[PDB]
Amino acid sequence: ELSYLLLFSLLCCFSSSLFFIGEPQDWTCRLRQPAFGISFVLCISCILVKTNRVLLVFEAKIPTSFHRKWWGLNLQFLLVFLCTFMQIVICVIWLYTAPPSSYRNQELEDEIIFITCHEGSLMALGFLIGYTCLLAAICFFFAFKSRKLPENFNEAKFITFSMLIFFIVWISFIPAYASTYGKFVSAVEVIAILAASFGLLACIFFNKIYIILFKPSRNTIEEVRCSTAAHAFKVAARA
Amino acid sequence: LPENFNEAKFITFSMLIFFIVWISFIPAYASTYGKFVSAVEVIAILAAS
Amino acid sequence: AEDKAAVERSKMIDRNLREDGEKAAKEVKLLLLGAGESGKSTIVK
Amino acid sequence: KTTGIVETHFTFKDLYFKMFDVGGQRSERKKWIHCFEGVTAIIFCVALSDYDLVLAEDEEMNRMHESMKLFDSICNNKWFTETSIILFLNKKDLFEEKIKRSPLTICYPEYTGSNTYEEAAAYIQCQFEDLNRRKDTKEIYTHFTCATDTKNVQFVFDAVTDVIIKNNLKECGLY
Amino acid sequence: TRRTLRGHLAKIYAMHWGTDSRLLVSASQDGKLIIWDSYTTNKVHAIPLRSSWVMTCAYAPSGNYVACGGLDNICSIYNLKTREGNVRVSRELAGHTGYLSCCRFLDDNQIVTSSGDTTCALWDIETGQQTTTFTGHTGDVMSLSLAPDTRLFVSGACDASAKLWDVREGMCRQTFTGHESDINAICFFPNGNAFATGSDDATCRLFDLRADQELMTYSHDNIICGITSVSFSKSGRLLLAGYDDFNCNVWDALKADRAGVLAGHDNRVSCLGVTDDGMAVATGSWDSFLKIWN
Ligand SMILES: CCCCCCCC/C=C\CCCCCCCC(=O)OC[C@@H](COP(=O)(O)OCC[N+](C)(C)C)OC(=O)CCCCCCC/C=C/CCCCCCCC
Ligand SMILES: CCCCCCCC/C=C\CCCCCCCC(=O)O[C@H](COC(=O)CCCCCCC/C=C/CCCCCCCC)COP(=O)(O)OCC[N+](C)(C)C
Ligand SMILES: C[C@@H](NCCCc1cccc(C(F)(F)F)c1)c1cccc2ccccc12
């Protein structure tokens, strides 16, 4: 279920880059940034909730009193909603007070007219950036804590390498964003968004598709048993 | 091979990091003007090291 | 009066049963089968 | 003083175990076997010394061939679909001593191997572990033991922990 | 349903209505024994048990004693009466070989039990040694009910047969057949001249003592599960049966046609009973709930 939700949010993430191409308008400059912010926070939340469940399942060897309802199937979506609630409310408050707009800039250059979008309030954008970075940083710890889980349940190698690409790509573009202006800042934004989404999709899913469709082995339920048999040490038999 | 605390894996990790950093450096260098060329060229060195 | 006292008695009984069930839920129960005259006594020691 | 269910209690590494020895009931099993629906696992004991030289108060009823029948009946009950079995094969010293004189071919029709202890024990384990047909739901843990072996409690502990872990993955839908 | 009783935590195996048609008694596969109160759902007593393998329970006609039993092969009597304010074991009756599968109070000093040893017995609670032993069954006795005059009783065992004993002479006098599998329940007609059975063949039959014959069979083509409990209502017009498929059925004794159905349990029904005045029906199931229908 969380995989389906993550795939839907990632579909939203690629489609969110199509608002940065074409002539700016009043509503496009209002829908540019919140779309990507929410569509990426959703994926981060899905990853966090999934990892937190397997650990809680695996760290409950003693007969368990209540965590049974703590790892409920329906509460995962509630946790995801609680994680994205901050982004939702910040975007709503930002659009309420000082929404973006369209601007014809005649002061950057004498003989050229530039069409750009205003931001209304930079604080309301810094808050989104900080929240996304904080969740991405928490993903590092949640991947670190999950490194000792058995096979088919451990993904600590792929969570970190998808956040590293995101951080590197979005840090290396700071000088160009600060100094350069024109029609290429939008191209930089599109490239960064597209690269982050591609890295996430690849590093999360391309490893499994290969075992599922090709090398259809490690493919039955009579192997995943032996694989899950390592955390507690006795699964002994001859078969 | 776990010869020395899984040494053959961290080498692969570092090489991938190096390649990613410079591939990402290409477009950022290609779209920067003025005094920030040094800014975009120092960051890649620091990250790789 | 009598209904009230029965209410507190029932509440105390329910509390005791809840605690007993909570304590008993944390034990592993094993059924020891086996063929006749085959062992099942050394395992006990 | 009591007869019928017998109970033993012990602790190991912050766990509590309860063992029921209902083998002294001496009545029809089918009328009370369903009272144990909910046990974590079933511990089964088989003596390797019966492979031959001892039948049971009868003329053509091998003790091992009756233990196999009881294992087949128990492992495939309607009430024991999800409960795993811990199988103990005891008295291996006598088996090793008697292999050199009495081969294994007197018990089962086809091969054993080298008439060597290592090869006969593996074949007996394979034959005894093939009587289950619920392979998609339950699992079997086998551990050769003797009168001197003293590591049985850690085998039981680890098997119980593994059973508990896989049971929870199933509820959550993961496995 | 009119009242629902909660508080158990495991499967429920027995139940017996009180002689005042107000209080109950229930036994679950724990060490617990709760005395209920269907008028206002407040519990009265909760008795822990040494062995958590209870199979039957009974409530004394004097309202002062109860009984238990199970795979421990022992019947125990509890002093529910004034005993300084609590309950403690009065006597443990030993001597049976197999498990104990039914027990009924005759008086405050005599109790009849049936066991899986293919043997019933009549005990003496003051001494603890059985005074009469009823033998003749070749299978495990599963059910037992007493006549209104408490001078005759019947039994059913895992061999298809029913016997009519008398508590004084200690000898069987009549044997009734007709079933083709094990028999699980039995109870007398209110007049004491007939009884009904319930087997694993999904059929219920009626027998009469004077004619020594089988009168009617109550069955259907949509039932394959066996019966676990059988009870007559007052005047004998309505026969109540509890089945494995979560359901309870109401029959017509005279014409053998279904007249109702009871469906409120999510698990197998293991016990049911009707009050002395025929005012209510109680049902127990393999979950931890009880219900009262009216
Ligand atoms: C261009 C500018 C960009 C600036 C960023 C670049 C900075 C330099 C980058 C990196 C230095 C460290 C690289 C970390 C690589 C992770 C290695 C890895 O992948 O190992 C995988 C797993 C464990 O191994 P396993 O699962 O495969 O097998 C285990 C199976 N068993 C247990 C049986 C053996 O390791 C784990 O658990 C993961 C534990 C946590 C990982 C630590 C990551 C720390 C990241 C710091 C960067 C912060 C952003 C920079 C902010 C600056 C703002 C101005
Ligand atoms: C994970 C990473 C995801 C990112 C995707 C990477 C692929 C992107 C492909 C193309 C993006 C180009 C952006 C177009 C913007 C228009 C700018 C333009 O093309 O104009 C032209 C500029 O360009 C160029 O001559 C080329 C720019 C030089 C780049 C270095 C390339 C050689 C690299 C060494 C790095 C290490 C390589 C390692 C090999 C890896 C192989 C495995 C002319 O304009 P100018 O003279 O006024 O510029 C002046 C800019 N100043 C002031 C900085 C000079
Ligand atoms: C679409 C994109 N806005 C990028 C312009 C600000 C910026 C440009 C260049 C570098 C940096 C940063 F690396 F300093 F963050 C920020 C965006 C919208 C909403 C949330 C976001 C969260 C993280 C990253 C991008 C987010």
Chains that touch D (3 or more CB pairs under 8 A): A, C, E
Beta bridge partners of E129: none
Q: What is the DSSP letter of C30?
A: E
A100 and A30 Cβ atoms separated by less than 8 Å: yes
Burial class (CB within 10 angstroms; exposed 0-12, middle 13-18, buried 19+) of A172: buried
Alpha carbon distances (Å) from E240 to E228, E253, E266, E270: 11, 10, 19, 13
A7 and A34 Cβ atoms separated by less than 8 Å: no
Angle between helices B7-30 and A184-201 (to 10 degrees): 160
Cα torsion for D45, D140, D161, D136, to the nearest 10°? -150
Q: Per residue, what are the HEC states of A105-170? A: ECCCCCCCCEEEECCCCCHHHHHHHHHHHHHHHHHHHHHHCCCCCCCCCCCHHHHHHHHHHHHHHH
Ligand 3 pocket test: pick from A18, A94, A170 the residue with the most ligand atoms within 8 Å of its Cβ. Answer: A170
Closest C-alpha to ligand 1, atom 12: B14
Pairing of strands E111-115, E100-105: antiparallel
Angle between helices B37-48 and A156-172 (to 10 degrees): 160
Least CA distance to C6: which residue of chain E? E42
- CA-to-CA distance for E239 and E256, rounded, in angstroms? 10
CB contact under 8 Å between C35 and D147, yes or no, is no
Q: Per residue, what are the HEC states of E5-48? A: ECCCCCCEEEECCCCCCCECCEEECCCCEEECECCCCCCCEECC
Alpha carbon distances (Å) from A27 to A35, A37, A52, A209, E146: 12, 17, 38, 39, 87
How far is CA C30 from its chain centroid? 14
CB contact under 8 Å between D19 and C34, yes or no, is no
Q: Which of E42, E78, E41, E38 is nearest to E58 (CA)?
A: E78
- CA-to-CA distance for C28 and E175, rounded, in angstroms? 47
Question: If you compute the radius of gyration of chain C from its CA atoms, what whole number of angstroms results?
Answer: 21
E174 and E216 Cβ atoms separated by less than 8 Å: no
D166 and D158 Cβ atoms separated by less than 8 Å: no
Look-up: residue for tokens 């999800």?
D82
D2 annotated ligand binder: yes
CB contact under 8 Å between C9 and E7, yes or no, is no
Which bin fits E118, alpha (ψ -120 to 50), beta or left (φ > 0)?
A: left
CB contact under 8 Å between E9 and C17, yes or no, is yes
Question: If you compute the radius of gyration of chain D from its CA atoms, what whole number of angstroms results?
Answer: 18
CB contact under 8 Å between D171 and A68, yes or no, is yes
CB contact under 8 Å between C3 and E9, yes or no, is no
3-state secondary structure of E81: coil
E71 and E87 Cβ atoms separated by less than 8 Å: no
3-state secondary structure of A79: helix
C21 annotated ligand binder: no
Beta bridge partners of C30: D19, D41
Give the closest ligand to the alpha carbon of residue A128.
3
Alpha helix (H) ranges present in B1-49? 7-30, 37-48
User: Would you tell me how many other CB atoms lie within 10 Å of the CB of residue E230?
Assistant: 26
The answer to whether residue B31 neighbours chain A at the CB level (below 8 Å) is yes
Atom of ligand 3 nearest to the CA of A32: 1
Closest C-alpha to ligand 3, atom 11: A170
- CA-to-CA distance for E206 and E212, rounded, in angstroms? 11
- CA-to-CA distance for D72 and D129, rounded, in angstroms? 10
Task: Identify the helix (H) or strand (E) that includes residue E77.
Answer: strand E75-79
Pairing of strands E89-93, E75-79: antiparallel
- Single-letter code of the amino acid located at D49: S
Ligand 1 neighbours (beta carbon < 6 A)? A 140, 143-144, 147-148, 154, 156-157, 160-161, 167-168, 171-172; B 13, 17, 21, 43, 47
Alpha carbon distances (Å) from C24 to A51, A162, B49, D34: 31, 46, 58, 20
Q: Which of E87, E81, E120, E123 is nearest to E106 (CA)?
A: E123
* Contacts of A120 by beta carbon, 8 Å cutoff, 6+ apart: A94, A97, A98, A99, A100, A101
- Single-letter code of the amino acid located at E232: F
Ligand 2 pocket test: pick from B26, B29, B38, B40 the residue with the most ligand atoms within 8 Å of its Cβ. Answer: B26
- CA-to-CA distance for E74 and E91, rounded, in angstroms? 10
Structure token digits, residue D10: 């012990």
List the C28-32 sheet strands across, edge first.
Answer: D6-11, D16-21, C28-32, D41-47, D84-90, D140-144
Structure token digits, residue E35: 């005395």
- CA-to-CA distance for E250 and C37, rounded, in angstroms? 50
Question: If you compute the radius of gyration of chain A from its CA atoms, what whole number of angstroms results?
Answer: 22
- CA-to-CA distance for A58 and A61, rounded, in angstroms? 7
CB contact under 8 Å between C6 and E46, yes or no, is no
E123 and E111 Cβ atoms separated by less than 8 Å: yes
Helix count and strand count (H, E) for chain E:
0, 28
- Single-letter code of the amino acid located at A186: S
* Contacts of A177 by beta carbon, 8 Å cutoff, 6+ apart: A185, A188
C23 annotated ligand binder: no
User: Would you tell me how many other CB atoms lie within 10 Å of the CB of residue E11?
Assistant: 20
- CA-to-CA distance for E289 and E265, rounded, in angstroms? 8
- CA-to-CA distance for A89 and A216, rounded, in angstroms? 46
Structure token digits, residue D27: 């009545």
Task: Spell out a b/e string for E108-117, using b for 16 or more CB atoms within 10 Å of the CB, else e.
Answer: bebbbbbbbb
Question: Experimental method for this entry?
Answer: cryo-EM
Question: If you compute the radius of gyration of chain E from its CA atoms, what whole number of angstroms results?
Answer: 18
Look-up: residue for tokens 């008086």?
E107
Ligand 3 neighbours (beta carbon < 6 A)? A 33, 36-37, 128-129, 132, 170-171, 173-174, 177, 189
3-state secondary structure of D126: helix
The answer to whether residue C35 neighbours chain E at the CB level (below 8 Å) is no
Could you please report the per-residue DSSP string of E45-73?
EE---SSS-B---EE-TTSSEEE--BTT-
User: Would you tell me how many other CB atoms lie within 10 Å of the CB of residue B27?
Assistant: 19
- CA-to-CA distance for E76 and E66, rounded, in angstroms? 8
Task: Identify the helix (H) or strand (E) that includes residue C8.
Answer: helix C2-24
Task: Tell me whether chains C and D touch (3+ CB pairs under 8 A).
Answer: yes
The answer to whether residue B20 neighbours chain A at the CB level (below 8 Å) is yes
Could you please report the per-residue DSSP string of A46-71?
HHHHHHHHHHHHHT--SPPSSHHHHT
Q: Which of E114, E150, E116, E149 is nearest to E133 (CA)?
A: E114
Pairing of strands C28-32, D41-47: parallel
- Single-letter code of the amino acid located at A17: S
- CA-to-CA distance for D87 and E21, rounded, in angstroms? 51
Q: What is the DSSP letter of D107?
A: T
- CA-to-CA distance for E190 and E193, rounded, in angstroms? 8
Burial class (CB within 10 angstroms; exposed 0-12, middle 13-18, buried 19+) of A63: middle
Pairing of strands E111-115, E119-122: antiparallel
C40 annotated ligand binder: yes
The HSE-up count of residue C42 (CA atoms within 13 Å, CB side) is 17
Q: What are phi and psi of E289, to 5 degrees?
A: -120, 155
A36 and A193 Cβ atoms separated by less than 8 Å: yes
Give the closest ligand to the alpha carbon of residue A13.
3
Residues of chain E contacting C7 with CB distance shorter than 8 Å: 42
Pairing of strands A102-105, E75-79: unpaired
Alpha carbon distances (Å) from A131 to A40, A122, A126, E160, E274: 11, 14, 9, 76, 67
Pairing of strands E119-122, E132-135: antiparallel
- CA-to-CA distance for B27 and B23, rounded, in angstroms? 8
Structure token digits, residue D173: 């839908």
Task: Identify the helix (H) or strand (E) that includes residue A225.
Answer: helix A221-228
Alpha carbon distances (Å) from E12 to E30, E89, E285: 9, 22, 6
CB contact under 8 Å between D88 and C26, yes or no, is no
Structure token digits, residue C17: 């049963």
Query: Which of D31, D33, D34, D39 is the best residue to mutate to test the E interface, defined by the most E CB atoms within 10 Å of its own CB?
Result: D31
Task: Tell me whether chains D and A touch (3+ CB pairs under 8 A).
Answer: yes
Query: Which of A172, A180, A198 is the best residue to mutate to test the B interface, defined by the most B CB atoms within 10 Å of its own CB?
Result: A172
Give the closest ligand to the alpha carbon of residue B38.
2
Which bin fits E7, alpha (ψ -120 to 50), beta or left (φ > 0)?
A: left
Structure token digits, residue E146: 């007493």
